Amino acid sequence: QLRYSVPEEQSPGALVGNVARALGLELRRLGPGCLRINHLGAPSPRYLELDLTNGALFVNERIDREALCEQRPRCLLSLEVLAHNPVAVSAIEVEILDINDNSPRFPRPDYQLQVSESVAPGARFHIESAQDPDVGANSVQTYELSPSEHFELDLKPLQENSKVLELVLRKGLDREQTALHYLVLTAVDGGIPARSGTAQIAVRVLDTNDNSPAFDQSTYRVQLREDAPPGTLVVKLNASDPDEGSNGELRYSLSSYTSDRERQLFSIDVTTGEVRVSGTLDYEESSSYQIYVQATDRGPVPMAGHCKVLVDIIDVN
Ligand SMILES: *[C@@H]1O[C@H](CO)[C@@H](O)[C@H](O)[C@H]1NC(C)=O
Ligand SMILES: *[C@H]1O[C@H](CO)[C@@H](O)[C@H](O)[C@@H]1O
Ligand SMILES: *[C@H]1O[C@H](CO)[C@@H](O)[C@H](O)[C@@H]1O
Ligand SMILES: [Ca+2]
Ligand SMILES: [Ca+2]
Ligand SMILES: [Ca+2]
Ligand SMILES: [Ca+2]
Ligand SMILES: [Ca+2]
Ligand SMILES: [Ca+2]
């Protein structure tokens, strides 16, 4: 047939071709109503018009390839040119070229991802692909991710013109270090200049009980007078747990390894961690005491920290 290529979205009056010269048709053989226009085997609006004065085919209306052909790779208008004296029918095909007049667009602007802190590196997360109503090179080609030490993208060709996008955990997460990672995902087409679309991804690091309680010091040394009354404050122990909520909540207790006698002599407060004197003290009975104290989590798997209190009884009278 006769074939022309017209880029979409040209303003009316743009020249397509010289039809009369191409088909060897004298202008006298052309008249009103001599141009028929078809799309997909059905008649269509006057996207094109033929000038009877110079035999030129030109753009008569806005031609939007996206509306016409959507995602189909080829966009073709079928024309019939009708001549008389003698009667002749010439078929013309007009290809509508795609331009990069659309940007890549994600279905949503904001995405939220929940990842447990225990999740090990090399884990992979589904992320939704962007869409670009253009075709070929003008459609989505590459993705890039905002700078992150923890996450990277994997982009793989899948079919003819679509790709698989995967979010990959490259480095371990630590909620105590950072609880929320802000990521921007950018989709880019292959048009020149390239057009972009972005989506925000918020990565929330869920807490695991991966920290055990810890005292400021391993060992405490205290001098206690033997005549110290019961309820006397021996020492205030401070333990801390950086985990979240129940996982960082501590209860103080004396270790089971402590002797029965010491439990009678000494007591510790479960919440505050104040070690106090319970029973009367005798330097003759004992020169020293060794109290083992532990602090425990309220997490699903309770975690513990330990320290030793060394009590020096001071002789009186
Ligand atoms: C525990 O913390 C309190 C509050 O700052 C402080 O007064 C006390 O000395 C601390 N105890 C120890 C053993 O450091
Ligand atoms: C759209 O914009 C992004 C940055 O926002 C570019 O990286 C891309 O190449 C396109 O120009
Ligand atoms: C992602 O970022 C681009 C460029 O900052 C915005 O234009 C877009 O709307 C989204 O916020
Ligand atoms: Ca268009
Ligand atoms: Ca287009
Ligand atoms: Ca595009
Ligand atoms: Ca941690
Ligand atoms: Ca934790
Ligand atoms: Ca903990």
Which two three-digit tokens encode residue 112? 């939220």
Of the candidates 264, 253, 266, which has an alpha carbon nearest to the alpha carbon of residue 311?
Answer: 266
- For residue 262, give the amino acid letter: E
Strand bridging mode 140-145 / 180-189: antiparallel
CA 186 to chain centre: 10
Cβ-based neighbours of 97, under 8 Å, separated by 6 or more? 5, 6, 7, 8, 65, 75
Which two three-digit tokens encode residue 99? 């331009």
- Tell me the C-alpha distance between 183 and 146, whole Å: 6
CATH number of the domain enclosing 284: 2.60.40.60
Q: Of 70, 99, 128, which residue sits at a domain end?
A: 99
The DSSP letter of residue 131 is: B
- Is 183 found in the same domain as 245? no
- Counting ligand 2 atoms within 8 A of each CB, the residue from 186, 189, 192 with the most, and so the one to mutate, is 186
Q: Which DSSP string do the residues of 51-90 spell out, in sequence order?
A: ETTTTEEEE-S---HHHHHTT-S--EEEEEEEETTTTEEE
Cβ-based neighbours of 143, under 8 Å, separated by 6 or more? 130, 153, 155, 165, 185, 186, 187, 188
Which two three-digit tokens encode residue 134? 């253009």
Helices (H) and strands (E) counted in the chain, each on its own, are 3, 24
E strand or H helix that includes residue 261: helix 260-265
Which two three-digit tokens encode residue 98? 């795609």
- Is 151 found in the same domain as 108? yes
- Phi then psi for residue 2, to 5 deg, are -90, 130
Which two three-digit tokens encode residue 187? 């989709």
CA atoms lying within 13 Å on the CB side of residue 1: 15
Please report the resolution in angstroms.
Answer: 2.4
Cβ-based neighbours of 96, under 8 Å, separated by 6 or more? 6, 7, 8, 63, 65, 68, 69, 75, 76, 77
Q: Of 99, 132, 152, which residue sits at a domain end?
A: 99
Q: Is 188 in the pocket of ligand 2 (CB under 6 A)?
A: yes
State whether residue 35 is helix, strand or coil: strand
Strand pairing partners for 105? 131
Do residues 209 and 303 lie in contact, with contact meaning Cβ atoms separated by under 8 Å?
yes
- Is 220 found in the same domain as 161? no
Number of domains in the chain: 3
132 is in an annotated binding site: yes
Q: Of 164, 181, 207, which residue sits at a domain end?
A: 207
Q: Whose CA is nearest to atom 4 of ligand 3?
A: 198
- Is 64 found in the same domain as 7? yes
Query: What kind of experiment solved this structure?
Result: X-ray
- Counting ligand 1 atoms within 8 A of each CB, the residue from 218, 222, 237, 238 with the most, and so the one to mutate, is 238
- Is 301 found in the same domain as 216? yes
Do residues 18 and 27 lie in contact, with contact meaning Cβ atoms separated by under 8 Å?
no
Show the domain range for 189.
Answer: 100-207
Of the candidates 256, 239, 238, which has an alpha carbon nearest to the alpha carbon of residue 297?
Answer: 239
Distances in Å between the alpha carbon of 12 and those of 48, 68, 101, 149? 9, 17, 18, 52
- Is 276 found in the same domain as 180? no
